[PDB]
Design a protein around this nucleic acid. Structure first.
Ligand SMILES: Nc1nc2c(ncn2[C@H]2C[C@H](O)[C@@H](COP(=O)(O)OP(=O)(O)OP(=O)(O)O)O2)c(=O)[nH]1
Ligand SMILES: [Cl-]
Ligand SMILES: [Mn+2]
Ligand SMILES: [Mn+2]
Ligand SMILES: [Mn+2]
Ligand SMILES: [Mn+2]
Ligand SMILES: [Mn+2]
Ligand SMILES: [Mn+2]
Ligand code: NA
Length: 328
DNA sequence: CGGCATACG
DNA sequence: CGTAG
DNA sequence: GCCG
């Protein structure tokens, strides 16, 4: 039929059930704002099943046998098919709680727990936060100052410009190091809200200490509007040129040794749901523990060597999916 | 019923 | 607590 | 919320 794990099926970026999947994703997001990770996962998984179907769902009949469709998710789809709207979804959409939690958690440096505390304190707007700046972290101050630019979609044209700049700094920091585009743009997205890069070097060990050297060089070139500072992940805000001005862009930089590069490439290419499902599959179906550093057999107490993403899918007994089919 | 990814800053 | 896919 |  339809397999139960998202890593077992191709999921393209564009598909035939966009409206249905978007509605279920609203309910998933709302569940996350209420701390119900289980409900969030079911609604995310149900949405992803629809993304993987070969044609539009027209009749409730067509949901029979699909994994992750039970009474609740089927009723949502039934209302959308019959009336074009689901009352529960529309109620969530217009709710003050949903709109405020969405606004607050979109802030770089603000998670669900912080947003919820602010909501309970009575805060509702960005200007509310700006009027009490002593309660903010430096990271949150940065996220709030740059929030407007960070709400503007990053375009593929923007990505090519950023990659050349990152390569320049990486080349001075360590000749021979390479820069690979990851995240949503590697999956074929035409827009995004950040750019993700993975950096390595072909000689194992030479990447040790690389990211501080890369960051200092970017910072000396005036391109870093914010970053946290030894480390291997950097979540920063870049200054990106624009016609007669510039805009702030979120950029994630990650370093891995070449021995781990296939695992890090897999992990950082996503999607987020794809990776959660793949790690769940590995552990629950194969008894293997997967992360962005490796794949561990806890019985033999050994790590799998991988030279490619293809190797990792083979180790796990899964058909290979290119990045553009990992859009779970 | 228990489980729900798995890390680093 | 934040961040990431 | 759903699966096994
Ligand atoms: N400031 C701001 N942030 C936004 C807005 N819309 C979304 N975001 C943030 C919230 C999320 O953390 C993030 C989602 O970005 P993307 O959809 O590009 O996904 P992400 O990069 O998380 O994953 P991906 O690399 O595609 O697998 O963007 C907005 O209007 N303003
Ligand atoms: Cl839950
Ligand atoms: Mn229900
Ligand atoms: Mn009706
Ligand atoms: Mn991204
Ligand atoms: Mn990112
Ligand atoms: Mn590491
Ligand atoms: Mn994200
Ligand atoms: Na946030």
């Amino acid at each position: 039929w339809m397999p139960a794990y998202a890593c077992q099926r191709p999921t393209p970026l564009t598909h035939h059930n966009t409206g249905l999947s978007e509605a279920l994703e609203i309910l998933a997001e709302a569940a996350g704002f209420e701390g119900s990770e289980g409900r969030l996962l079911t609604f995310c998984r149900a949405a992803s099943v629809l993304k993987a179907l070969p044609s539009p769902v027209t009749t409730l009949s067509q949901l029979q046998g699909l994994p992750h469709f039970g009474e609740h998710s089927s009723r949502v789809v039934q209302e959308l098919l019959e009336h074009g709207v689901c009352e529960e979804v529309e109620r969530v959409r217009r709710s003050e709680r949903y709109q405020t939690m969405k606004l607050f958690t979109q802030i770089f440096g603000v998670g669900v727990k912080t947003a919820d505390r602010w909501y309970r304190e009575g805060l509702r707007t960005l200007d509310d936060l700006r009027e009490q700046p002593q309660k903010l972290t430096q990271q949150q101050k940065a996220g709030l100052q740059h929030h407007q630019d960070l709400s503007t979609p990053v375009l593929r044209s923007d990505v090519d410009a950023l990659q050349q700049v990152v390569e320049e700094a990486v080349g001075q920091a360590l000749p021979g190091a390479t820069v690979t585009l990851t995240g949503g743009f590697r999956r074929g997205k035409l827009q995004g809200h950040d750019v993700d890069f993975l950096i390595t070097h072909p000689k194992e060990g030479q990447e040790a200490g690389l990211l501080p050297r890369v960051m200092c060089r970017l910072q000396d070139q005036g391109l870093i509007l914010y970053h946290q500072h030894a480390f291997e992940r950097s979540f920063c805000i870049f200054r990106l040129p624009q016609p007669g001005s510039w805009k702030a862009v979120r950029v994630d930089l990650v370093v891995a040794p070449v021995s781990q590069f296939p695992f890090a490439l897999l992990g950082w290419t996503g999607s987020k749901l794809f990776q959660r499902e793949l790690r769940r599959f590995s552990r629950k179906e194969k008894g293997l523990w997967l992360n962005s550093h490796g794949l561990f057999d806890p019985e033999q107490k050994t790590f799998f060597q991988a030279a490619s993403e293809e190797d990792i899918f083979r180790h796990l007994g899964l058909e290979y999916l290119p990045p553009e089919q990992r859009n779970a």
